[PDB]
Design a protein around this ligand. Structure first.
Ligand SMILES: C=C(OP(=O)(O)OC[C@@H](O)[C@@H](O)[C@@H](O)Cn1c2nc(=O)[nH]c(=O)c-2cc2ccc(O)cc21)C(=O)O
Ligand SMILES: [Ca+2]
Ligand SMILES: [Ca+2]
Lengths: 314, 318
């Protein structure tokens, strides 16, 4: 009755909704449930900004599973004034103010998250991958002086991506971080561990740079089942993932599967799901093609079922 | 050439509008500015709230002189929304009684980020004023902490507690048994950059008709500021706030121009005033202080411009 999922980005949050739909959790509950879902949540996008601590992946899971997905009725008047001062919705800022106060009074991020969830009641345990800072950065050639300069991922994404040469990612602080409370336990004790179809480099990937988490994944007796984020069939055949490009990995199910690789070798996957019509073959890894479009929590629920079935879990 | 005004509250800001209009400064400018205006701004109401630093008197002056103030309220931003406040309420946090508007929050966010990065309040204020262009130099009375505290009897339990001015004024509206004010940090607070110099080098110093106990009084508790006032060569002219009642009660001062004037007292003795302006039809007689009754209603920037002219004329300054 124990599922743990590694997640980041909007697609991680939508994947969790499907897990809840399958298992009758949170907004999809009728009578209080038998199963428990644990999300190990990317912190690589987290940043101190305008004096406040912003945790995007934790907030997106929390709002999404809490029914508040940014927000509804959102205004950006504070954001407007900030631009007028020459430098983030109004409701969003409330979350940031409360979190920053708890962090400055010594609550770890895992406890901060738990406190915020009393109000959102997401119906899942949302564990930060670490309580220490581990901030994804991007090394660019800065055009002002031609220097290789490390930029926070959120600034790269909005300002520099596709406009300057981009060389690599750096996980600033990962080496000094430890797995957050309960993370290693959630991975070791699960009936099954799922890699949600998030960006492999900057949503799942940074979770894997936190000392201890890759070890737990390699050694856990739980089946580890990954979901491909590559969807073929779009108009003009889609576009390559920009973050995979930075590390020179093609935007294919085959290439992302080898990125995680096989637990039987030195990698992370027992199972790899690809979208219908797609193909991959990876020694030691059971690959299966099934619908992987998160149209709605009901279609995501079928996706989660395919992962359980592939892993032989009830 | 040089005017220094001590200010606190909405009335301080409006008095500063009167000065600018008289002298062609800020939004009232038409042609080259001949004068410079410096405000020494109370910091006694400043509080940390929800992790950000609120400086109400500095913001009231900045917003008013820069055209962003709310007219109905006299504090905070115009065209304000309260979505972040409502959301704070939905999280069930305290304090739930201080109004932190969305637009106003940006000011507090920038200020707090700068203060925590090591910038002193005077430079933060200068940074924020690059956007508002108030047309006056807004000097925090101190860059250090000096906060007004209130000793009350708590109604929940009949115990004596001390609370910040903000809880007294906004949360209880002073409807609680109140026994004394305490200027915590005043004795340890150095006069802020430029403050003593602006008082020493002024052609005239004006005491705005702000709250005498909680707006002008706290500035006087900063040890260097009161000293500069006693020794500056400039005439010091005060404006009666009586034409606030709770604050005078707590300290046992009657609510009259004569009494408030004596609260500040005469420079000739141990006081601070050279002169004292009261509303027309008011008589006040204080030894060593030239008193003149003139219209003292800050109806509009040139009603006040005329109030300022009467102050210069009482001082004999041109
Ligand atoms: C009357 C005089 O003094 P003064 O006008 O400062 O009174 C206190 C108040 O204005 C100020 O200290 C502050 O409290 C005003 N003020 C609020 N006042 C309220 O009553 N309720 C509120 O929610 C509220 C929120 C708020 C937020 C930011 C801010 O910068 C000021 C704010 C005078 O000297 O002439
Ligand atoms: Ca509460
Ligand atoms: Ca000091």
């Amino acid at each position: 009755m124990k599922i743990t999922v590694l997640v980041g980005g909007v697609g991680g949050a939508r994947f969790l909704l499907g897990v809840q739909n399958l298992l009758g959790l949170g907004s999809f509950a009728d009578g209080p449930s038998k199963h428990e879902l644990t999300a190990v949540v990317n912190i690589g996008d987290d940043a101190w900004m305008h004096g406040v601590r912003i945790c995007p992946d934790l907030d997106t899971c929390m709002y999404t599973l809490g029914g508040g997905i940014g927000h509804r009725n959102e205004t950006w008047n504070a954001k407007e004034e900030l631009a007028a001062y020459g430098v983030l919705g109004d409701r969003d800022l409330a979350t940031h103010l409360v979190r920053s106060q708890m962090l400055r009074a010594g609550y770890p991020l895992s406890q901060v998250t738990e406190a915020l969830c009393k109000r959102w009641q997401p119906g899942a345990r949302l564990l930060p991958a670490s309580d220490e800072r581990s901030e994804t950065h991007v090394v660019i050639t800065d055009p002002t002086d031609g220097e290789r300069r490390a930029i926070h991922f959120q600034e790269w994404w909005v300002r520099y991506r596709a406009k300057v040469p981009t060389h690599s990612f750096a996980y600033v602080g990962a080496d000094q971080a430890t797995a957050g409370p309960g993370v290693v336990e959630a991975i070791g004790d699960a009936d099954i561990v799922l890699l949600a179809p998030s960006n492999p480099v900057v949503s799942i990937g940074p979770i894997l740079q936190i000392p201890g988490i890759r070890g737990a994944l390699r050694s856990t007796s739980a089946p580890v089942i990954g979901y491909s984020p590559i969807i073929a069939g779009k108009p003009l055949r889609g576009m390559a993932d920009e973050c995979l490009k930075v590390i020179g990995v093609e935007s294919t199910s085959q290439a992302v599967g080898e990125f995680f690789g096989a637990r039987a070798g030195t990698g992370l996957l027992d199972g790899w799901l690809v979208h219908e019509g797609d193909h991959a073959q990876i020694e030691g890894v059971k690959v299966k093609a099934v619908p992987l479009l998160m149209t709605d929590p009901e279609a995501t629920a079928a996706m989660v079922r395919a992962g359980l079935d592939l892993a032989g879990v009830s």
